[PDB]
């Protein structure tokens, strides 16, 4: 079921790899998360947002789940629109890509770092398999029909491969 998504990323000739298991919320893609140690911190990073990186212990004074711009955008793979991509505490650099998309209506976690910075929140599967909306081309699908359609678009595109 597992997917690996290249994200362009805006205004560099340079890609960005997460993994998702849930691919068919990519419409509720609100931002991008890489682990405080993930290279494209010390490749495509300025020098003040590394040295915040490298100097400040990344902890929250109102909420656990926090993140630091990376000054990067991401753009989404099948909308006209860019995302944020942040540095957050609760990625695992060494886990998979070290790197997520947030899906905060579909996501407990990707939602409580998206109400901390007022990141959209895009609800995606109807509560009932379930039914996608606001998803263009999986609009109507079940889960299982979408999950289908959207690696069979991400491979079409070669922005996506199965993962196991
Ligand atoms: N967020 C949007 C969407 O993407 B999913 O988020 C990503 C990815 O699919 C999933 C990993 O899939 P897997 O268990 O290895 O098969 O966990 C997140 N993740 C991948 N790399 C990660 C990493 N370095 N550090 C922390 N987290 C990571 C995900 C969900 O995941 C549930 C399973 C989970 O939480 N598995 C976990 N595995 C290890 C820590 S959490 C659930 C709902 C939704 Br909508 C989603």
Redesign the pocket.
């Known amino acids: 079921?597992?997917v690996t998504i290249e994200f362009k990323i805006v205004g560099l000739n340079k890609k960005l790899k997460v993994?998702?298991?849930?691919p068919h919320?990519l419409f509720?893609a609100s931002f991008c998360a890489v682990?405080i140690e993930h290279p494209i911190v010390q490749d495509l990073m300025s020098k003040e947002i590394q040295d915040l990186i490298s100097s400040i212990k990344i902890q929250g004074k109102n909420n656990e789940k926090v993140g630091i711009y990376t000054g990067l955008n991401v753009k989404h793979p099948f909308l006209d629109k860019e995302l944020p991509l942040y540095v957050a505490n609760?990625?695992?650099?060494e886990?998979?890509?070290?790197?997520?998309?947030?899906?905060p209506a579909?996501?407990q976690?990707?939602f409580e770092f998206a109400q901390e910075y007022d990141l959209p929140i895009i609800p995606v599967i109807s509560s009932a398999n379930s039914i996608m909306f606001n998803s263009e081309f999986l609009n109507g699908l079940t889960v299982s029909e979408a999950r289908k359609v959207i690696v069979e678009k991400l491979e079409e595109k070669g922005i996506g491969k199965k993962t196991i």
């Not at 609760?90 to 650099?93: G, K, S």
């Not at 886990?95 to 899906?103: M, T």
């Open positions: 079921e597992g993994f998702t298991t849930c919320t509720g682990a609760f990625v695992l650099m886990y998979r890509e070290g790197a997520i998309f947030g899906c579909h996501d976690r990707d």
